[PDB]
């Protein structure tokens, strides 16, 4: 299944960075993306989870588990062999009901024989993947709480109904700001990682280049990818290779002076910012091959780590000259 490539899509920046950012370190939380409903928001989400090597999973588990061994008790697996599939990527409707987000035990069918009666549901899906949700501002509180739990936590724990139902969910939270429905409660925006815009352009050229751009691909999507599929390719060396210097790059105390100064001088306090802040620079040095955390890549992803915290570009230019 062909899917429009990432390096082919136009302008996004702050999003594609968000993106790569996320697939080095996960640890730096949710991607918060606003904006207007054209622009297209889970296009670089999917094209990301493309280009990504495929993963190993047992073929008939609910949870992708990497091997029979990992599969779930409560899971029965009759597909043992493992095979190689897509990133996956799940989409979170409006509406959704909290056992198809979440699972759960059919009682009716768990008094027969217990336990192998849990009904997996969207989290079970995500697992080793991207979870994305299109109108989040949309969602109930208590629903976004336990996705912002659960993609910290990295597991999905539905203690309910006189069982205790535990399963593997680790994946990158995307969570779209429409338009305006009411810029919501602000206590759950701090729980996201990075927060940034996609704009829909204006102009008449750039819509018409986007436009063309789609319907080459459509044309042939076969040989659209031919032609694009280097670039995503240096795009997934990147990160695999960030990765792999992640835990090597420094954190000098200057940096650390920097993060706990930039986030003073604002609004958006300490900790959870001042580290996803850290976090956030740290994954973009791995990104360019740097050593160690410097000034600049602070910079960079300050209004991304820092902007949707607030009760920015003016105090980091001001604080962080």
Same mark, same amino acid.
Do not use: W, Y
């Given at each position: 299944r062909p899917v429009f490539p990432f390096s082919a899509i136009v302008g996004q920046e702050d999003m594609k960075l968000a993106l790569l950012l996320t697939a080095v370190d996960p640890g730096i939380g949710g991607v918060l993306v606003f904006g207007d409903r054209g622009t297209g928001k889970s296009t670089a989400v999917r094209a990301l989870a493309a280009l990504l %090597?495929?993963? /190993?999973? !047992?073929?008939?588990?609910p949870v992708s588990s990497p091997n029979v061994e990992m599969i779930p008790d409560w899971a029965t697996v009759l597909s043992t062999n493992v095979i190689r599939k897509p990133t996956p990527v799940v989409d979170l409707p409006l509406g959704v009901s909290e056992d198809r987000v979440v699972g759960a035990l059919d009682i009716e069918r768990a008094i027969s024989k217990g336990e192998k009666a849990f009904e997996p549901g969207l989290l079970a899906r995500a697992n080793r993947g991207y979870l994305y949700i299109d109108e989040c501002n949309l969602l109930e509180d208590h629903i976004v709480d336990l996705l912002l739990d659960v993609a910290q936590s990295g597991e999905n724990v539905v203690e309910r109904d006189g069982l @205790?139902?535990?399963? %593997?969910?680790?994946?990158?939270? !995307?969570? @779209?700001?429409? %338009?305006?429905?009411?810029?919501?409660?602000?206590?759950?925006?701090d729980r996201f990682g990075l @927060?940034?815009?996609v704009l829909s352009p204006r102009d008449v050229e750039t819509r018409v280049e986007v436009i063309r751009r789609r319907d080459t691909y459509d044309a042939d999507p076969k040989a659209f990818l031919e032609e694009w599929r280097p670039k995503d390719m240096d795009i997934r060396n990147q990160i695999l290779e960030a990765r792999e210097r992640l835990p090597k790059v420094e954190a000098p105390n200057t940096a650390l002076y920097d993060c706990a100064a930039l986030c003073i001088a604002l609004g958006s306090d300490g900790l959870r910012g001042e580290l996803t802040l850290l976090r956030s620079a740290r994954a973009l040095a791995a990104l360019e091959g740097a050593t160690a955390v410097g000034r600049d890549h602070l910079? #960079?992803?300050? &209004?991304?780590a820092?902007?949707?915290?607030? #009760? !920015?570009?003016? &105090? !980091? /230019? /001001? &604080?962080? %000259?």
């Open positions: %090597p495929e993963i /190993e999973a !047992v073929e008939g588990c @205790s139902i535990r399963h %593997p969910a680790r994946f990158v939270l !995307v969570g @779209s700001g429409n %338009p305006e429905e009411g810029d919501l409660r602000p206590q759950l925006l @927060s940034v815009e910079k #960079r992803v300050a &209004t991304m820092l902007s949707h915290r607030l #009760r !920015v570009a003016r &105090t !980091v /230019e /001001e &604080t962080l %000259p």
